[PDB]
Amino acid sequence: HMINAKLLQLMVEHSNDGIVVAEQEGNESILIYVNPAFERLTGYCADDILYQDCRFLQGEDHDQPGIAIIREAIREGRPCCQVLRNYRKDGSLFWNELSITPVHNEADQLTYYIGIQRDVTEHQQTQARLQELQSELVHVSRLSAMGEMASALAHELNQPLAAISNYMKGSRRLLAGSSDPNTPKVESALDRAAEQALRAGQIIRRLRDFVARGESEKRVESLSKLIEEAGALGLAGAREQNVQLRFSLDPGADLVLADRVQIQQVLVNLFRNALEAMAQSQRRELVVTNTPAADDMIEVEVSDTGSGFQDDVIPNLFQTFFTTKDTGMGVGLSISRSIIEAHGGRMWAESNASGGATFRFTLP
Amino acid sequence: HMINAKLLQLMVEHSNDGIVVAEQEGNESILIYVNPAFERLTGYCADDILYQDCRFLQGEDHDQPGIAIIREAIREGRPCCQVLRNYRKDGSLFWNELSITPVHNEADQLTYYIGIQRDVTEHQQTQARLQELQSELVHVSRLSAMGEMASALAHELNQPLAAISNYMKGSRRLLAGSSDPNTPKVESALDRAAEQALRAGQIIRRLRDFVARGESEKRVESLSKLIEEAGALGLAGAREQNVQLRFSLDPGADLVLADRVQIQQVLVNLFRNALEAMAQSQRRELVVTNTPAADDMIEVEVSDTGSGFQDDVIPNLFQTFFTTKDTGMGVGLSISRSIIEAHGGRMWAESNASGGATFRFTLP
Numbered sequence: 081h082m083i084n085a086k087l088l089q090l091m092v093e094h095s096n097d098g099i100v101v102a103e104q105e106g107n108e109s110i111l112i113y114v115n116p117a118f119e120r121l122t123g124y125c126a127d128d129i130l131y132q133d134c135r136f137l138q139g140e141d142h143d144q145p146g147i148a149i150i151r152e153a154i155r156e157g158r159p160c161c162q163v164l165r166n167y168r169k170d171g172s173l174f175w176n177e178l179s180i181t182p183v184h185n186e187a188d189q190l191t192y193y194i195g196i197q198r199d200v201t202e203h204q205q206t207q208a209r210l211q212e213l214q215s216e217l218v219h220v221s222r223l224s225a226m227g228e229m230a231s232a233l234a235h236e237l238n239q240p241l242a243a244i245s246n247y248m249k250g251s252r253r254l255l256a257g258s259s260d261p262n263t264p265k266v267e268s269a270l271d272r273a274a275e276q277a278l279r280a281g282q283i284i285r286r287l288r289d290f291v292a293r294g295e296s297e298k299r300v301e302s303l304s305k306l307i308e309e310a311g312a313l314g315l316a317g318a319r320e321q322n323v324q325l326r327f328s329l330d331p332g333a334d335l336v337l338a339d340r341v342q343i344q345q346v347l348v349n350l351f352r353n354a355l356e357a358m359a360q361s362q363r364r365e366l367v368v369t370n371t372p373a374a375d376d377m378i379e380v381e382v383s384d385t386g387s388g389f390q391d392d393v394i395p396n397l398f399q400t401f402f403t404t405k406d407t408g409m410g411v412g413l414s415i416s417r418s419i420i421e422a423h424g425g426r427m428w429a430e431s432n433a434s435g436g437a438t439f440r441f442t443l444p
Numbered sequence: 445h446m447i448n449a450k451l452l453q454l455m456v457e458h459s460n461d462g463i464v465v466a467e468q469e470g471n472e473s474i475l476i477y478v479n480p481a482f483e484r485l486t487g488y489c490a491d492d493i494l495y496q497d498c499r500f501l502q503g504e505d506h507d508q509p510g511i512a513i514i515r516e517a518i519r520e521g522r523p524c525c526q527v528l529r530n531y532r533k534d535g536s537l538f539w540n541e542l543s544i545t546p547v548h549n550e551a552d553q554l555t556y557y558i559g560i561q562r563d564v565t566e567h568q569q570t571q572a573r574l575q576e577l578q579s580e581l582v583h584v585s586r587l588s589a590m591g592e593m594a595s596a597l598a599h600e601l602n603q604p605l606a607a608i609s610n611y612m613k614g615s616r617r618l619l620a621g622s623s624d625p626n627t628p629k630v631e632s633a634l635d636r637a638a639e640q641a642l643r644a645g646q647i648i649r650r651l652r653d654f655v656a657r658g659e660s661e662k663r664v665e666s667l668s669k670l671i672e673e674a675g676a677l678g679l680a681g682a683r684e685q686n687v688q689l690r691f692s693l694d695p696g697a698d699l700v701l702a703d704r705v706q707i708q709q710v711l712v713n714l715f716r717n718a719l720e721a722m723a724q725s726q727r728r729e730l731v732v733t734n735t736p737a738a739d740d741m742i743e744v745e746v747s748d749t750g751s752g753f754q755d756d757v758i759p760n761l762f763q764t765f766f767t768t769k770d771t772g773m774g775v776g777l778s779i780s781r782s783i784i785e786a787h788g789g790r791m792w793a794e795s796n797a798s799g800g801a802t803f804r805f806t807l808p
């Protein structure tokens with residue numbers, strides 16, 4: 081009609097997408113045409129797999145929810161789109177997105193099917209990794225948050241509880257030189273008061289290390305990889321708010337010794353902090369840069385042109401619970417600073433020439 | 445090469461996927477064939493859009509990154525796959541996935557292109573909302589974890605600190621009827637000891653309500669909608685780990701009064717907990733069901749066939765910090781029960797007949 085059928089077949093033959101045509105034979109949907117893209121996608125030759133049902137690509141994996149959906153859609157004659165785990169000739173696993181359209185041929189009085197097949201292995205794998213990274217980030221966020229919470233309340237209670245015990249020791253000394261008949265009752269009451277104060281010390285340390293159970297070591301980590309992993313989580317919104325991203329990396333300064341989950345959470349917090357500071361900024365530029373620093377250490381810098389720092393803010397930063405945000409907890413930077421220094425580096429902040437914020441840290 | 449080109453054209457014509465053929469004319473890739481699927485996808489008639497470049501679907505939206513990728517891929521003759529913001533005839537926006545394959549016809553000495561076009565508007569939208577839900581979950585996880593923590597250490601310290609103040613009041617009472625010369629010194633020391641206890645009392649509530657700032661809003665919420673949002677986060681792996689999902693919902697008993705972020709986080713925890721319990725299970729079945737239930741309420745049930753509960757476990761459940769997991773906090777169920785009861789319902793647990801766990805809650 082619009083185009084020669086010979087040309088249309090030529091396009092299908094050379095399409096980069098897997099395209100097959102199948103023929104209904106009872107409970108079989110036997111292949112009657114496959115294009116070279118389908119031969120590459122599946123690793124099979126056309127002369128081998130023709131005139132049998134495509135379900136052989138599943139091989140052994142039959143507990144897939146999409147299989148029943150396809151069978152019902154074929155039984156109803158309606159099209160369908162499902163993702164299945166298929167296996168190529170060499171046995172390698174790929175996820176195959178099947179777009180199947182049942183078509184009825186009047187000339188044959190027979191039912192055919194056209195299937196467009198696309199490899200979504202790369203989509204499934206990066207998505208599955210993001211769910212790992214999302215659950216990993218949530219887990220370490222909750223653990224470290226209560227960790228900073230526990231050390232904060234412990235240190236802030238350290239002074240009043242110690243004062244209580246000091247007043248007990250002083251009162252007991254005053255009561256030592258006493259002959260009053262009620263003195264032993266007072267001394268016993270002061271004893272139990274001292275015990276309860278010490279027990280409060282026991283309690284806070286007990287619930288502190290209940291959320292600190294499970295701690296890690298360090299390993300060789302690629303900065304490129306962890307910057308990309310942290311960016312996938314923390315920088316997902318740059319395009320919608322027009323933040324210009326620049327990752328300036330040093331190939332000579334790419335491998336560091338770091339525990340990947342702690343540096344991930346530092347960068348996620350820095351990335352999110354930077355996006356928030358640039359919400360109302362006219363210039364929106366985020367730069368990440370690595371250089372060797374200290375004496376045979378390596379420094380990573382993340383600078384923004386965001387809302388920046390008032391004169392009083394910078395020295396109140398990296399301090400537990402300090403925040404300028406209505407809903408901020410002010411623990412992100414405090415946890416981050418402790419993490420970088422525990423890795424053998426230093427972490428600090430400064431205003432940049434554009435009125436924004438610059439954070440630096442070093443890693444070995 | 446295996447089927448008649450007329451039959452192959454018949455399949456392309458009736459494919460549920462948009463399939464077009466274009467012809468290179470300098471910097472133009474003019475349409476020479478579109479199938480009815482593309483006419484429905486684009487809302488245009490074939491007689492209208494033939495023999496012009498498909499770029500009219502972009503309209504004015506030319507600040508799309510895929511346009512440069514497609515233009516260069518066409519210039520190089522290599523295939524490409526990009527998603528673009530296109531607008532149909534009525535002006536409504538849809539996201540279009542373009543698989544373009546440049547093909548060379550020797551008979552013409554001309555370059556053609558075959559394009560498979562599918563509407564991915566829903567995929568892009570559910571993914572963008574999923575990115576929102578992930579950041580939303582991280583935010584409230586850290587907030588609520590320190591929130592249930594703030595009440596936790598306060599409740600465990602409530603007894604020793606109250607005892608300290610009571611022993612101060614009792615000691616002062618004993619010292620009232622005393623003539624010993626050192627008594628006024630003792631009384632003054634006991635006063636400051638009591639003051640430090642009260643100051644420690646202030647401290648825990650102060651650091652408690654620093655994380656209680658954003659805590660107290662409610663709203664009308666759809667259970668169907670929030671179950672799907674929670675499922676997107678918590679149940680993302682059911683298909684890939686072969687968990688059978690069944691949501692048996694009643695549309696007449698679907699709308700409840702609930703604060704959506706807190707119930708979402710309750711469900712996310714239940715969904716992840718259920719997947720973990722079925723990690724080593726031979727039968728993997730997850731059932732979510734809503735029914736009318738109480739004198740004013742509607743009940744939602746989440747049942748699994750997972751590892752279930754040892755005989756001693758259930759009575760320590762819904763209790764803060766009780767966990768059977770090496771890395772667990774044991775606050776999820778505790779936070780969940782407080783959230784559901786604050787929303788006017790009740791929450792409890794029981795073992796099911798398959799050896800797994802069943803959780804129920806009700807909402808108005």
Ligand SMILES: Cc1cc2nc3c(=O)[nH]c(=O)nc-3n(C[C@H](O)[C@H](O)[C@H](O)COP(=O)(O)O)c2cc1C
Nearest residue numbers: 102109134135137138147150151164180193194195
């Ligand atoms: C045109 C067409 C193409 C198909 N391609 C594939 C495929 O590439 N991989 C696959 O695992 N199943 C594929 N299937 C699905 C199988 O043909 C089969 O219908 C499905 O596994 C469910 O059928 P069953 O319930 O009889 O197993 C395709 C089906 C049709 C109609």
Ligand SMILES: Cc1cc2nc3c(=O)[nH]c(=O)nc-3n(C[C@H](O)[C@H](O)[C@H](O)COP(=O)(O)O)c2cc1C
Nearest residue numbers: 466473498499501502511514515528544557558559
């Ligand atoms: C076969 C084919 C189909 C195309 N279909 C679409 C389409 O449906 N929507 C769209 O926005 N662009 C589509 N394009 C892309 C445009 O034709 C154009 O190449 C693109 O906008 C980049 O070229 P330009 O930089 O000259 O605009 C298609 C291209 C080809 C070759």
Ligand SMILES: Nc1ncnc2c1ncn2[C@@H]1O[C@H](COP(=O)(O)OP(=O)(O)OP(=O)(O)O)[C@@H](O)[C@H]1O
Nearest residue numbers: 353354357388403404405408409410411412413437
């Ligand atoms: N990129 C930045 N630009 C400007 N100010 C920043 C930037 N990053 C952090 N800050 C400042 O640091 C303060 C503390 O931030 P921090 O990361 O510790 O926590 P937060 O963002 O307030 O809260 P939360 O713990 O919920 O993430 C913020 O209130 C803000 O004033």
Ligand SMILES: Nc1ncnc2c1ncn2[C@@H]1O[C@H](COP(=O)(O)OP(=O)(O)OP(=O)(O)O)[C@@H](O)[C@H]1O
Nearest residue numbers: 717718721752767768769772773774775776777801
């Ligand atoms: N669906 C379930 N099947 C079996 N056991 C479960 C299920 N849901 C919860 N549990 C049990 O309840 C215990 C407490 O769970 P809870 O939700 O309070 O926290 P958690 O999963 O241990 O930790 P976190 O709060 O960090 O997620 C778990 O250790 C687990 O043994």
